[PDB]
């Protein structure tokens, strides 16, 4: 939510800032989906006492 509001930053420079917010936000989204899909599954059967 810190990066999304700048995504609507308009003007000629709007595209510049707009791309950065989406990729960062998209990176977080994929980072929380995988961290809730792969990391939980991986931590089991991979991490050992």
């Amino acid at each position: 939510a810190v990066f999304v509001p700048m995504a609507f930053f308009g003007g000629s420079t709007g595209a510049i800032y707009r791309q950065f917010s989406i990729t960062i936000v998209s990176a977080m989204a994929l980072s929380v989906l995988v961290a809730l899909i792969l990391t939980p599954a991986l931590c089991a059967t991979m991490l050992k006492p």
Partner: protein, 395 residues
Amino acid sequence: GMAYLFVRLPSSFLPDEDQGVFMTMVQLPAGATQERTQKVLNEVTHYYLTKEKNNVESVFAVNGFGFAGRGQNTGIAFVSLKDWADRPGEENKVEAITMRATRAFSQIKDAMVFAFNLPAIVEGFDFELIDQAGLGHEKLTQARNQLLAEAAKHPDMLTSVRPNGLEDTPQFKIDIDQEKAQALGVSINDINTTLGAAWGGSYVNDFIDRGRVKKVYVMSEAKYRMLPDDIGDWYVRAADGQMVPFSAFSSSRWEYGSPRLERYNGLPSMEILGQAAPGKSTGEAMELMEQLASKLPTGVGYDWTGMSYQERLSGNQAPSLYAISLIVVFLCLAALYESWSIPFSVMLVVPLGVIGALLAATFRGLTNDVYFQVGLLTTIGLSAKNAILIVEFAK
């Protein structure tokens, strides 16, 4: 401390990166023959391959073409550097060579030379006076001189203010006496064609060249169209079969004219560029010129263009959005922390992260460019991530 550093930091669009290629522009005073430009351009080519042999790999000197306007008294020289790894240190970076080159070119007395690094995008302020009332080119030119001359009265707020259009150069006006032509029995069209064909190439037809179509130009030989007195040689046939010279029915007089007329939004104009004060930001310079343009001859307006026009649209959207971001994060934080008070403990940490960015940014003159905004907008996230990673367990 964060507030003080934030304001003092200058505002800029994007750093001029070392792209490995800079374009060297060479210009000569009014009426400089193509031969003279080739003489100077050799010096630029000679200089680069002698003083900068360690840096420049190749030089492509183009004579007769330039961005300021095609002509004989202009020149450009595309230059490409060796591999970035082949230019160790900062003394051999693009900004360094151009400063040495431009300083080294102060000894080219006749010509004006300055190598400027290619900008960030493909394409300072671009200010343009417009003669919206119809004063005329000559009237506007002096008006341009007044504003630019008066611009020298504020060196602390304006810098490197210069025109972009070629200055007036002598023109060899020739007038044809209408009455004399009829008496001598020479058609006006005949006079115009021979004058406009001999002294200037006249497209005629097409021919086949090794299986290709190419233009056939008719134009006077080089030696016979070089001096004003040569007009006395071009006899033109009269209707009655007689031959008459140009001097018999025409007169010539030297007069001043403009070799590059520029227009804007459908009105006459010329372009003036320059930097915005020493060290200050570009925004400040814009307002002062409006005041300068306020007291100008009647009918002389102005309008922005190029990159400066962009700043007039979405000029200050950055502060507005950050308020939304701070508001949105406050609302979202309160949603997860079940309180309207705890979210402060991870908001009042934001300055602790921003100060490091500003402190280091001003530690190297990052000039608050676009790359800084992402830096500021991500370090704030890192500080939020750190705080959220601490208070969360405490709760």
